[PDB]
Amino acid sequence: SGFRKMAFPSGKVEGCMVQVTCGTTTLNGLWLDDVVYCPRHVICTSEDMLNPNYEDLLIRKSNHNFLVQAGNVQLRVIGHSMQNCVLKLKVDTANPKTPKYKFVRIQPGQTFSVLACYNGSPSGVYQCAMRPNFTIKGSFLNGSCGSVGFNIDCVSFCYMHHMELPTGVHAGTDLEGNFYGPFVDRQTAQAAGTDTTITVNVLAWLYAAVINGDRWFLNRFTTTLNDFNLVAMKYNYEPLTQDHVDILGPLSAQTGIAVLDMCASLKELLQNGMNGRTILGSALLEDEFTPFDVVRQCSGVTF
Amino acid sequence: SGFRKMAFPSGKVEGCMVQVTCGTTTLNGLWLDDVVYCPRHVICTSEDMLNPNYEDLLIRKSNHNFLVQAGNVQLRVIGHSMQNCVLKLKVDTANPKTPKYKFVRIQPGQTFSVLACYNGSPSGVYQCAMRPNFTIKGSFLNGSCGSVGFNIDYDCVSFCYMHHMELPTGVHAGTDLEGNFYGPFVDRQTAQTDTTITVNVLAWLYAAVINGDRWFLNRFTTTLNDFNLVAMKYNYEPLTQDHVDILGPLSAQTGIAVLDMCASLKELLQNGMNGRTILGSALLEDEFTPFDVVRQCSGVTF
Ligand SMILES: *[C@H](O)[C@H](Cc1ccc[nH]c1=O)NC(=O)[C@H](CC1CCCCC1)NC(=O)c1cc2ccccc2[nH]1
Ligand SMILES: *[C@H](O)[C@H](Cc1ccc[nH]c1=O)NC(=O)[C@H](CC1CCCCC1)NC(=O)c1cc2ccccc2[nH]1
Ligand code: NA
């Protein structure tokens, strides 16, 4: 019993982290097979950062301009190319620690683990969700760029870190270099959209609470999907779809609480508040656990 | 910026986890050099459990009764002994992934990362505190026994917890790696008050300030004695001068004296948060030490 924000074990990703230096800038790279992936902004001088023309700047670089270090070993760069906002440095050695891996672009609400790194070395691991506004609420300092987010299914990499937006939230790309959200890699203040609560995840966590015997909030009513969403909207919650209802099905079967019944209990929590009570030790409704995250933790799924 | 409950990178510990089966019981072991450490209750049967005579039960086991699996390799057990509540299975192969390590016994209020494992395989990692009542508020299912807690400093893993049991309230109990339980608990089948870690709450308020969440700051100061009068009423541990000293680094970094911050905590205790949050929480958080805050906010690596 118990319910914690649980990250994936990080060892498989630790073995892939390297340091990449261009000029005055050092950040992290991801070494898989004979390629090192990192943010393309590594190539900017401080002046370049204001309005970079990355294609032009890259033409001026040579392979030797990229200093890639795996621990105490310098890797020899033999080619360089850019894919969207990610730089791909071909090296003459394949990483012997490369796990089975894939690159995935995740949807809002999906969670992942971040291995925060500086100078190619790990600082810590924590669980993040992709917010509906395409930011993540991470813990990233200058130097952390190139740190990645991942799931273990095969390691599925979904996020590479590029920048910190004005609200102290974080923005980055998938491993094909496409930003999540409308953001661009230029040194200017960029506003995130208004964020919302990930409803399907709140429902998942209420199921985790029931599994753990914390069930005071269960009421005796039901609701339709439409009537639930009419309330959700008023409290800045995302719409719940029928696909979400189906995804929550196995948790509904395990607990005996139909999804629409759980929605009626959530509706009451939204309308009346929690009145000083906690659920799974929290005084707020938690939205950074997906339905799979709940099953993973409550059933002991391993890797 | 940003502040998260961040666990240590777990790779060095993952390379030490093995599966240990005795009879019908499977749990995890920690393989360092040529010894596998695991809870001694692995040797109990369902009848053995009310008052197990572990010395006798261990004598009656063969090395052959312990099936130790490191991935897809069975390790040959060549000896079995016990140190307090930990079983030590000597194996004929030294773990080539053994990190630099120490066994440490931590104090209440200190934190560590747990690598939760099942069948010798890592499932997840999370940070938690040793409570003042010597339990941990973990996430552990049947089969997780032998999972460990640890801290890292540079290249050295300090193992501090091995998991043995879940108490009726759903919190968790275990030993150090010398086999001594934290708290009054015992490894037998029988039925077996906490406080808030004030210095950690203060550390986390400093973390909030460092990360720009400043609304709860006020212009007032308090004496240590006046603060503790309030603290005690809310079931907070007394703040000692030693605690004030340990908050020195964070006080210097923010420019906010400890007794200034204490007045902000006093107001939060007496008046609540008025619908606001601090670092995303609607409760005061006590599972970050002063060192944890400095580590995370300065980007310390391993
Ligand atoms: C990469 O290591 C670093 C990550 C970082 C820095 C500071 C705080 N948290 C962090 O995670 N990223 C930057 O420093 C980044 C570099 C810049 C990105 C666009 C292309 C050119 C290089 N810059 C920012 O994150 C940044 C710039 C800026 C300007 C106005 C407001 C906010 C802001 N954030
Ligand atoms: C070891 O893998 C397992 C850990 C566990 C089990 C269930 C839930 N969460 C967990 O972390 N430990 C046990 O199953 C343990 C065995 C027992 C330890 C003392 C010596 C003899 C063997 N039993 C418990 O943790 C346990 C039994 C029990 C009965 C009533 C209420 C609570 C309770 N906890
Ligand atoms: Na104050």
UniProtKB/Swiss-Prot annotation, chain A:
The record places domain Peptidase C30 at 1-303
Activity regulation reads: Inhibited by pyridone-containing alpha-ketoamides compounds 13a and 13b. In turn, alpha-ketoamide 13b (tert-butyl (1-((S)-1-(((S)-4-(benzylamino)-3,4-dioxo-1-((S)-2-oxopyrrolidin-3-yl)butan-2-yl)amino)-3-cyclopropyl-1-oxopropan-2-yl)-2-oxo-1,2-dihydropyridin-3-yl)carbamate) inhibits SARS-CoV-2 replication in human lung cells. Inhibited ex vivo by michael acceptor inhibitor N3. Inhibited ex vivo by compound 11a and 11b.
Residues joined by cross-link Glycyl lysine isopeptide (Lys-Gly) (interchain with G-Cter in ubiquitin) = K5, K90
Tell me which residues this entry annotates as catalytic.
H41 (for 3cl-pro activity), C145 (nucleophile)
- Catalytic reactions on record: TSAVLQ-|-SGFRK-NH2 and SGVTFQ-|-GKFKK the two peptides corresponding to the two self-cleavage sites of the SARS 3C-like proteinase are the two most reactive peptide substrates. The enzyme exhibits a strong preference for substrates containing Gln at P1 position and Leu at P2 position
Result of altering Q187A: Does not affect ability to cleave and inactivate human TRMT1
Variant or mutagenesis effect after changing P132H = In strain: Omicron/BA.1, Omicron/BA.2, Omicron/BA.2.12.1, Omicron/BA.2.75, Omicron/BA.4, Omicron/BA.5, Omicron/BQ.1.1, Omicron/XBB.1.5, Omicron/EG.5.1
Role summary: Cleaves the C-terminus of replicase polyprotein at 11 sites. Recognizes substrates containing the core sequence [ILMVF]-Q-|-[SGACN]. Cleaves and inactivates human TRMT1, preventing tRNA guanine(26)-dimethylation of tRNAs. May cleave human NLRP1 in lung epithelial cells, thereby activating the NLRP1 inflammasome pathway. May cleave human GSDMD, triggering alternative GSDME-mediated epithelial cell death upon activation of the NLRP1 inflammasome, which may enhance the release interleukins 1B, 6, 16 and 18. Also able to bind an ADP-ribose-1''-phosphate (ADRP).
What is this protein's record name?
3C-like proteinase nsp5
Gene source species? Severe acute respiratory syndrome coronavirus 2
Q: Complete protein: which residues are present?
A: 3264 to 3568 of 7096
